[PDB]
Amino acid sequence: AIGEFMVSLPRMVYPQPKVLTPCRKDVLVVTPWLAPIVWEGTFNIDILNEQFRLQNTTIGLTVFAIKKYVAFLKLFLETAEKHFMVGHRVHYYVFTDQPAAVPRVTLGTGRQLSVLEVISDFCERRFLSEVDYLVCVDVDMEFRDHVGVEILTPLFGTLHPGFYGSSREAFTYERRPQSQAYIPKDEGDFYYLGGFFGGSVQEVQRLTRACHQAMMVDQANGIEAVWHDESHLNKYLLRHKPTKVLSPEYLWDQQLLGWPAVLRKLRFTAVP
Ligand SMILES: OC[C@H]1O[C@@H](O)[C@H](O)[C@@H](O)[C@H]1O
Ligand SMILES: [Cl-]
Numbered sequence: 001a002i003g004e005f006m007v008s009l010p011r012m013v014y015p016q017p018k019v020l021t022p023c024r025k026d027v028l029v030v031t032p033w034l035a036p037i038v039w040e041g042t043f044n045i046d047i048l049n050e051q052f053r054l055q056n057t058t059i060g061l062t063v064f065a066i067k068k069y070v071a072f073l074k075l076f077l078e079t080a081e082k083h084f085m086v087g088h089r090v091h092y093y094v095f096t097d098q099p100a101a102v103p104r105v106t107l108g109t110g111r112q113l114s115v116l117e118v119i120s121d122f123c124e125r126r127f128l129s130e131v132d133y134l135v136c137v138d139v140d141m142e143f144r145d146h147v148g149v150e151i152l153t154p155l156f157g158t159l160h161p162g163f164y165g166s167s168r169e170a171f172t173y174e175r176r177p178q179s180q181a182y183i184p185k186d187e188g189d190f191y192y193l194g195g196f197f198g199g200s201v202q203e204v205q206r207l208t209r210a211c212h213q214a215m216m217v218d219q220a221n222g223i224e225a226v227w228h229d230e231s232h233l234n235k236y237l238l239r240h241k242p243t244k245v246l247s248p249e250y251l252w253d254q255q256l257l258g259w260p261a262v263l264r265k266l267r268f269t270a271v272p
């Protein structure tokens with residue numbers, strides 16, 4: 001459940017937070033609109049796990065696996081079982097054009113998977129009654145470390161691993177005024193990834209609905225955003241600030257970017 005009566009936490013023993021000792025001194029851990037930026041070292045997962053378990057939180061994880069992308073499902077699901085929201089209720093939603101091609105992956109208790117053929121006979125209304133949060137990611141990836149409730153919030157975006165240190169002028173936002181995804185050179189907070197975003201079901205549906213309409217307008221105007229859905233997602237998150245921003249630890253490509261010291265963990269990565 002979400003947004004309800006929250007019971008008291010039990011007695012817990014952990015290191016006292018130090019007011020005069022910054023969490024991380026090498027990175028920004030909070031945005032100008034007071035949304036935390038999630039980096040390793042900023043959170044005590046035991047406290048967060050307690051908070052979300054006491055709420056009987058259910059997380060939905062959605063992926064689209066079309067054509068040859070169905071080949072990525074086995075590794076994706078197997079690693080998700082080892083690193084994604086372990087201990088919490090998880091409902092995987094696999095949208096594919098090849099239902100019979102979905103691998104039979106063994107799931108831990110309290111976790112289930114639904115295969116939706118695709119456009120589809122699945123009404124978004126179902127998400128509202130089955131899960132509390134929705135996490136939307138790409139399938140040609142693998143989890144390599146912890147990805148848990150620390151990411152849960154009404155609406156979150158993830159910093160693109162190739163632009164987290166870039167100035168806004170270098171961001172590959174759609175720069176044509178004729179597009180609904182247009183963002184001028186003097187605007188923009190960060191460059192978010194289209195491949196990893198989420199939040200409450202309500203907020204995720206609001207975002208996808210907004211982008212769907214924006215892309216339809218562009219289509220009618222004979223224009224296609226430079227980076228398609230990702231371009232519109234950036235425009236949306238610029239005008240509707242996310243309540244949490246995930247660091248590049250959450251979507252990295254070690255082949256193209258290595259393992260910088262600023263990244264204490266590589267949690268979700270592209271498959272070579
Ligand atoms: O500049 C944006 C682009 O960056 C590339 O590295 C990535 O492969 C694309 O999917 C898109 O995100
Ligand atoms: Cl997605």
Ligand SMILES: [Cl-]
Nearest residue numbers: 062063136137
């Ligand atoms: Cl998705």
Ligand SMILES: [Hg+2]
Nearest residue numbers: 023024041042
């Ligand atoms: Hg800290």
Ligand SMILES: [Hg+2]
Nearest residue numbers: 062134135136
């Ligand atoms: Hg989604």
Ligand SMILES: [Hg+2]
Nearest residue numbers: 210211232236
């Ligand atoms: Hg949008």
Ligand SMILES: [Hg+2]
Nearest residue numbers: 211212215229
């Ligand atoms: Hg869209």
Ligand SMILES: [Hg+2]
Nearest residue numbers: 211229232233
């Ligand atoms: Hg979008």
